[PDB]
Structure 1
Amino acid sequence: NPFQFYLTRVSGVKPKYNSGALHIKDILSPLFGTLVSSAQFNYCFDVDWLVKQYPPEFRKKPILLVHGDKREAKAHLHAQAKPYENISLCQAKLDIAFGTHHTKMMLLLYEEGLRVVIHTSNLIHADWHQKTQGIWLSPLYPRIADGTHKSGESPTHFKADLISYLMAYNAPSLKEWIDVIHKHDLSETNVYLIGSTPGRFQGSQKDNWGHFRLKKLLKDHASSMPNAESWPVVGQFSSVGSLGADESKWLCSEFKESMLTLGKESSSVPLYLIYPSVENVRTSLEGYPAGGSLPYSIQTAEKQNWLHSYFHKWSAETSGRSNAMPHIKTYMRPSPDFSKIAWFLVTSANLSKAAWGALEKNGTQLMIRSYELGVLFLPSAFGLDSFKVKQKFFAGMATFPVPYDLPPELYGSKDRPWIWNIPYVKAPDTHGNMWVP
């Protein structure tokens, strides 16, 4: 396949639903390359578990953990890593309040070249066990011969864009990885990088990050079609931030406006938001504990009940994953009959202003609180006008593997969004338990 978009392995589904899936042990296997050094960008780490996922012969190679933890949380992570002399740490600066380092990425340096993995899972056992998670695997990038002068750049500008993302950290350990990337040929890359970094961006820099980055790419590299107003927008996520008192504050005013963009020319577009209901979580493989990774709080939700009329259940019969709660985040633009898509994005970014950015200073400044990273699949990057939706995710090449069912199904009148910090004691989960936070 040209897309190299994978799901993680799920324990408990039939083998046909894991045949083309990837576990972290598969990614780090010697079959993918002879490891020299790696960087693990993430939010949550179980270091003992993480080292065990590397092949035994590679467990003493240098590992850099890129994280956002501060104060006692930072101390706890350093304590986890101190037993392993080969592990270094890089604290990403979070100078804007309420920001987090959400980016999930592996940089894998081999004797044979370099690989980049952009994915959605925390580095803990539970995130790779029974969740729906997404992975994009780069090609093996060869080294540019010493003395040869070439860009190693792709038509999607991925090399420059990845270096720009890393430069924003202003960190010495990542300057080393920038120099590694400079030395490799990334020209085969067919995806666009969409990142968020913390800051306040005006002028030219506004288009570098967050939903303005997405808008710029859709303006420049997608085409509008007739009846574009009938092509819905779908967003699918594992948490929701505070979006404001009504849809005009952010969701349908600047966020949807960026997501609607197609082509260079100057709204009733349907918006489908996919987020697990309480019943989805209760009947899941993990049961109610799956809701520990769906951190929508009652404090946030009670100020925006307007939002929940947009919500659709999690359903993923196409990939056998209806009971594997989603920690993947995806956004896409299907046709009115959901048979084609104009683009597809897999990312760490949830439905929040912190992740995507919010306009400030009379619309002239985009403020982002967090680090996020995803990759955008555009038909033009594959010589196509649109992608045909693959009917069965794992079945039998230019059709895009959408991991959940279309059309999405609206919540029923008795359904409620999963809210993690209130109790559920009416009906027990698949393990026999209630939920009492």
Structure 2
Amino acid sequence: NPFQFYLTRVSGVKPKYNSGALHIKDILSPLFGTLVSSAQFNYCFDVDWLVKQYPPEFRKKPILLVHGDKREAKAHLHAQAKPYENISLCQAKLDIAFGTHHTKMMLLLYEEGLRVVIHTSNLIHADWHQKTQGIWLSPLYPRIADGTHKSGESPTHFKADLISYLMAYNAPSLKEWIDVIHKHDLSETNVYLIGSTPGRFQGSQKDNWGHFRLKKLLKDHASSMPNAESWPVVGQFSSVGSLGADESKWLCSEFKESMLTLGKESSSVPLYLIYPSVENVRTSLEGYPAGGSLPYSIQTAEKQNWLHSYFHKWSAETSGRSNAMPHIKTYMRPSPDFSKIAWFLVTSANLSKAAWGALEKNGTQLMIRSYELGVLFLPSAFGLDSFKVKQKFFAPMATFPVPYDLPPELYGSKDRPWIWNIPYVKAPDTHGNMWVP
């Protein structure tokens, strides 16, 4: 395949559904490279568990943990890392309130080159056990020979864009990784980087991040087709923020507007949002505890009941993962019959203004609260006009492996979105348990 898009291994499904899936131990294996140093960007870490995922021969190499924790939470992370003298920490600044360091990325420096992994999983056992998660693996990037002056840049601008993303941290430990990236040849990269970083961006800087970055890439590197108004937008996520009193406040006015962009010329487009129902969670491999990783609060949900008419069940027969609750986040643009897609994005970004950005000051300023990162697959970057949808995820390689079922199925009249902080006590889950948060 050209795409290098993988799901994580799921315990408790038949082995055919893990054929070609990746566990964290596979990513860190000596088969992927002879590790010299690594950086782990994430939200949540179990350091004892993380260190055991590295092969023993690599377990003492330097590891940088890039996190967003403050106050008592920051102290706990430092206490976790203290027994491991090779572990350094970088606290990403979060100077806008209610922001999160949500980016999930590995930088892996080898004797043979450099690899970048952009994925969706926290660095805890539960996130790699029975969930649907997504991974993009970069090629092995060779070092540019000293004395040679080359850009090492790809047609998607990935090298400069990744450096720009890291520069926004203003962190000395990350300037070291910027210098590593500068020394490597990333020209084989066929995906576009879509990041979010905290700030208030005006003028052209608006196009650097969040949903305006997606809009700019779709304008410059995708083309509109006849009947484009008939091509739906699909968003699929594990958390929902406060979107406003109706769809015109943000969802259908600016978020959907960016996602429906195609080409440079200047809405009826259907919007499908995929988010687990209570029933999906109750009968999952984990049962109700899967809902601990599906944060949608009752306080937020009750403000926006209009939103739930957009909601569609989680179903993933194609990858054997209907019962592996999603922590992956994906966005894509299928054709009216769902047989082709105009693009596909895997990202950390949930359905949230904090992640994607919200316009302020009469539309002159894009405000983002959080760090997010994803990769965008555009047909043009592969010499194609569209991607065919892979019929069965694990069975021409111009076919993109969409990990869940199409078309998405609307919630039934008695279905409700999973809301994590209310009790579910009238029907036991897979393990015979009730949920009382």
TM-score by length of 1: 1.00
- State the alpha-carbon separation in 1 of the partners of residues 290 and 15 from structure 2: 22
- Give the secondary-structure state (helix, strand or coil) at the position aligned to 1:355: helix
Deviations 1:52-83 (A, max 9, x none): 00000000000000000000000000000000
What is the percentage of aligned positions where both structures have the same residue? 100
Aligned to 1:317: 317
Aligned to 1:288: 288
- State the alpha-carbon separation in 1 of the partners of residues 334 and 3 from structure 2: 17
Aligned to 1:168: 168
- State the alpha-carbon separation in 2 of the partners of residues 299 and 255 from structure 1: 22
Q: How far 1:285 moved relative to its partner? A: 0.2
Deviations 1:260-296 (A, max 9, x none): 0000000010000000000000000000000000000
Deviations 1:355-408 (A, max 9, x none): 000000110100000000000000000000000000000009110000000000
**CA 1:224/1:396 → structure 2, altered by over 3 Å: closer, same or farther?**
closer
Question: Any unmatched runs of 5+ in structure 1?
Answer: none
Deviations 1:23-60 (A, max 9, x none): 00000000000000000000000000000000000000
Deviations 1:406-430 (A, max 9, x none): 0000000000000000000111011
Cα RMSD, aligned residues only: 0.5
- Give the secondary-structure state (helix, strand or coil) at the position aligned to 1:25: helix
Aligned to 2:345: 345
Q: How far 1:205 moved relative to its partner? A: 0.4
Deviations 1:187-211 (A, max 9, x none): 0000000000000000110000000
Aligned to 2:143: 143
- State the alpha-carbon separation in 1 of the partners of residues 186 and 11 from structure 2: 34
Q: How far 1:244 moved relative to its partner? A: 0.1
Q: How far 1:300 moved relative to its partner? A: 0.2
Q: How far 1:351 moved relative to its partner? A: 0.2
- State the alpha-carbon separation in 2 of the partners of residues 67 and 15 from structure 1: 34
Aligned to 1:221: 221
Deviations 1:151-208 (A, max 9, x none): 0000000000000000000000000000000000000000000000000000110000
- State the alpha-carbon separation in 1 of the partners of residues 426 and 305 from structure 2: 22
- State the alpha-carbon separation in 2 of the partners of residues 398 and 52 from structure 1: 37
Deviations 1:212-235 (A, max 9, x none): 000000000000000000000000
**CA 1:198/1:147 → structure 2, altered by over 3 Å: closer, same or farther?**
same
- State the alpha-carbon separation in 2 of the partners of residues 163 and 371 from structure 1: 14
- State the alpha-carbon separation in 1 of the partners of residues 103 and 206 from structure 2: 20
- State the alpha-carbon separation in 2 of the partners of residues 363 and 5 from structure 1: 35
- State the alpha-carbon separation in 1 of the partners of residues 46 and 20 from structure 2: 26
Q: How far 1:110 moved relative to its partner? A: 0.1
- Give the secondary-structure state (helix, strand or coil) at the position aligned to 1:248: helix
Question: Any unmatched runs of 5+ in structure 2?
Answer: none
Q: 4+ runs of 1 displaced by more than 3 Å?
A: none
- Give the secondary-structure state (helix, strand or coil) at the position aligned to 1:410: coil
- State the alpha-carbon separation in 1 of the partners of residues 71 and 382 from structure 2: 46
Deviates more, 1:389-398 or 1:188-197: 389-398
Q: Does 1:185 align with 2:190?
A: no
- Give the secondary-structure state (helix, strand or coil) at the position aligned to 2:247: coil
- State the alpha-carbon separation in 1 of the partners of residues 37 and 203 from structure 2: 37
Q: Does 1:114 align with 2:111?
A: no
- State the alpha-carbon separation in 2 of the partners of residues 401 and 165 from structure 1: 27
- Give the secondary-structure state (helix, strand or coil) at the position aligned to 2:10: coil
Deviations 1:317-357 (A, max 9, x none): 00000000000000000000000000000000000000000
Aligned to 1:23: 23
- State the alpha-carbon separation in 1 of the partners of residues 264 and 436 from structure 2: 51
Q: How far 1:14 moved relative to its partner? A: 0.4
Equivalent runs, 1:248-397 vs 2, <5 Å = 248-395=248-395, 397=397
- State the alpha-carbon separation in 1 of the partners of residues 242 and 278 from structure 2: 20
- Give the secondary-structure state (helix, strand or coil) at the position aligned to 2:394: coil
- Give the secondary-structure state (helix, strand or coil) at the position aligned to 1:345: strand
Deviations 1:240-262 (A, max 9, x none): 00000000000000000000000
- State the alpha-carbon separation in 2 of the partners of residues 147 and 396 from structure 1: 41
- Give the secondary-structure state (helix, strand or coil) at the position aligned to 1:373: strand
- Give the secondary-structure state (helix, strand or coil) at the position aligned to 1:99: coil
- State the alpha-carbon separation in 2 of the partners of residues 397 and 92 from structure 1: 39
Aligned to 1:233: 233
Deviations 1:75-98 (A, max 9, x none): 000000000000000000000000
- State the alpha-carbon separation in 1 of the partners of residues 282 and 19 from structure 2: 27
- State the alpha-carbon separation in 2 of the partners of residues 373 and 86 from structure 1: 26
- Give the secondary-structure state (helix, strand or coil) at the position aligned to 2:37: strand
- State the alpha-carbon separation in 2 of the partners of residues 302 and 21 from structure 1: 38
Deviations 1:284-314 (A, max 9, x none): 0000000000000000000000000000000
Equivalent runs, 1:7-22 vs 2, <5 Å = 7-22=7-22
- Give the secondary-structure state (helix, strand or coil) at the position aligned to 1:384: coil
**CA 1:251/1:20 → structure 2, altered by over 3 Å: closer, same or farther?**
same
- State the alpha-carbon separation in 2 of the partners of residues 121 and 60 from structure 1: 23
TM-score by length of 2: 1.00
